[PDB]
Amino acid sequence: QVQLQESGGGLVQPGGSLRLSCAASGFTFSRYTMTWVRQAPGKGLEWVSNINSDGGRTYYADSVKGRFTISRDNTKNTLYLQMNSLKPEDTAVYYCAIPKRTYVPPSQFDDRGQGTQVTVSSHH
Amino acid sequence: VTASIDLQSVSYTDLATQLNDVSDFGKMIILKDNGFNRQVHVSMDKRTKIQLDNENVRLFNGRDKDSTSFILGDEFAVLRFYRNGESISYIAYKEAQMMNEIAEFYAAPFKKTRAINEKEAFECIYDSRGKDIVSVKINIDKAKKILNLPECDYINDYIKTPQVPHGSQTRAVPSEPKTVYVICLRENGSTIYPNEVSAQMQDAANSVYAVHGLKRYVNFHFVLYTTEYSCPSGDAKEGLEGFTASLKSNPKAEGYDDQIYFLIRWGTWDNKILGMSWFNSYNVNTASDFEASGMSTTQLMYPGVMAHELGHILGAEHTDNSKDLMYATFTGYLSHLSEKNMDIIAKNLGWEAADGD
Ligand SMILES: [Zn+2]
């Protein structure tokens, strides 16, 4: 079966950074377009970023462009999300996922990991 | 020692690795299947360039009578050849999900039918050792026998205009071929897959180069953009007249009124017309005002339609020879056989009989 496992979540203050990792197995990772999505409590699932099989093409939601960078290592079968300049509205559970199709932004997915929690506090 | 492609498991990465290793000297590649081994001398096709929306696309030739050829983009690869009289395409996309989309697309016409010999016509090829689809094999001749669809054709697929007056420009073979752009515009609201459009472009350019050694005179450079234009009805003649008018109001197309233009779609037009063209509308010396324009379907089951329409643009008439590209009903053949058409086409590209072949 497809297995995806996210890690690297945590709590930061505004302006902080985190790096998420997603370990993949059970499919030929290097052939697949891959996705990060996130879901805030009581809110709809939001697409964050896509990366094609070899990493040569990347796509980002407008809200994270310039702050988040997706990448992958096809030898270690791992997907990454480098998250800089974090804001309170980035708070969510983050999932790596296999989209059913390559078109952006995806809303339909084949499998998801169990998720990693990202929290950005606010004090204003 | 010799490189090979196993057609029982061929993937995008297989095709890309083999074809990227083809040098200017060419390379022998063995195509292997069950009890099938064809040694093919593969060469880079340096006559034609293709840019699609998202990718540059390179073409490759064999030198065999069964015209083995390849297409390699960043996103996809195609192997096409004839075997025992029938054309076979192997179509392989790089992203697993878009391969899945493509396979589903090509499998759909066979859903209704439960033909015993389906795999002869259409087969998903799975990764070597649930397995993933890495390519699909399509034999359009056996598919037509199985699907038994009504035939599309070319009857009345051009608009003729009063003949040009003669007006001493002819020259010998140029020192370099002239670059002629074939600017293809994806009709608004149409979904075109790159393997389908690229195959049509390859067949179109090659139908011209095979005539009178015309690669000495022309090298085609295809470009594919999107257009906001769509045909206002299913009328093909009306559709072309509106298409040509839409080129004149495209500020991007200013400066290129002397190139060749095709509106492309997946489907066909009313009365099952496959394409449409302005007849005898391109001459190297006089091309102007976007007059060398036409329209073409791109579906895999109708190879050579854009070649046929390009033939009309270059002055080729329909012929009575059912083996000719220029037959008025759809034949699936890809080559000009009419000597009269061959002379007309080459003269419009600057050739004269003194220059030989
Ligand atoms: Zn015709």
Nearest CA in chain B to A56: B74
Please say whether the beta carbons of A3 and A48 come within 8 A: no
Please say whether the beta carbons of B331 and B323 come within 8 A: yes
**Cα B206 to ligand 1 centre (Å):** 18
**Cα B158 to ligand 1 centre (Å):** 6
Q: What is chain A's length?
A: 124
Coil, helix or strand for B218? Answer: strand
**Residue given tokens 């649930």 in the structure block:** B130
Cα(B101)–Cα(A24) distance, rounded to whole angstroms? 22
Please say whether the beta carbons of B33 and B4 come within 8 A: no
Q: What are phi and psi of B104, to 5 degrees?
A: -60, -40
Q: What's the CATH number for A3-120?
A: 2.60.40.10
B336 annotated ligand-binding residue: no
Of the candidates B211, B205, B172, B188, the one whose C-alpha atom is nearest the C-alpha of residue B350 is B172
Long-range contacts, B103-110 (Cβ 8 Å, 24+): B103/B133, B103/B136, B105/B193, B106/B136, B106/B138, B106/B300, B107/B136, B109/B143, B109/B147, B110/B143, B110/B146, B110/B147
Q: Is the dihedral of CA A75, A79, A85, A86 positive or negative?
A: negative
A74 touches chain B (CB under 8 A): no
Give CA separation, B349 vs A98, B178, B180, in Å: 50, 9, 10
What method was applied to determine this entry? X-ray
**Concatenated DSSP letters of B132-145:** PEEEEEEEHHHHHH
Of the candidates A71, A69, A97, the one whose C-alpha atom is nearest the C-alpha of residue A83 is A69
Cα(B99)–Cα(B163) distance, rounded to whole angstroms? 48
CA-based diameter of chain A, in Å? 46
B308 annotated ligand-binding residue: yes
Cα(B193)–Cα(B102) distance, rounded to whole angstroms? 8
Please say whether the beta carbons of A47 and A107 come within 8 A: yes
**Concatenated DSSP letters of B284-309:** TTT--TT-SEEEEE--TTSTTHHHHH
Q: Which two tokens stand for residue A38?
A: 């996130």
What are the residue numbers of the active site of B? 309
Domain residue ranges in chain A? 3-120
CB-neighbour burial class of residue A48 (10 A; exposed 0-12, middle 13-18, buried 19+): buried
In Å, what resolution does this model reach?
1.7
Q: In terms of DSSP bridges, do strands B27-33 and B3-6 run parallel, antiparallel, or are they unpaired?
A: parallel
Residues with Cβ within 8 Å of B295's Cβ and at least 6 positions away in sequence, in order, are B231, B236, B239, B240, B243, B262, B263, B264, B265, B269, B275, B276, B277, B309
B312 annotated ligand-binding residue: yes
| Side chain identity, residue B155 | I
Residues with Cβ within 8 Å of B154's Cβ and at least 6 positions away in sequence, in order, are B273, B274, B275, B308, B318, B327, B328, B329, B330
Partners of residue B93 on adjacent β-strands: B76
Cα(A82)–Cα(B239) distance, rounded to whole angstroms? 50
Q: In terms of DSSP bridges, do strands B27-33 and B158-159 run parallel, antiparallel, or are they unpaired?
A: unpaired
Cα(B211)–Cα(B67) distance, rounded to whole angstroms? 16
Residues with Cβ within 8 Å of B350's Cβ and at least 6 positions away in sequence, in order, are B170, B171, B174, B178, B217, B218, B284, B285
**Cα B338 to ligand 1 centre (Å):** 14
Cα(B91)–Cα(B57) distance, rounded to whole angstroms? 14
Is A102 in Cβ contact with B95 (below 8 Å)?
A: yes
- Selecting from B94, B97, B127 the residue whose C-beta is nearest the C-beta of A101 gives B97
Cα(B165)–Cα(B148) distance, rounded to whole angstroms? 47
| Side chain identity, residue A45 | L
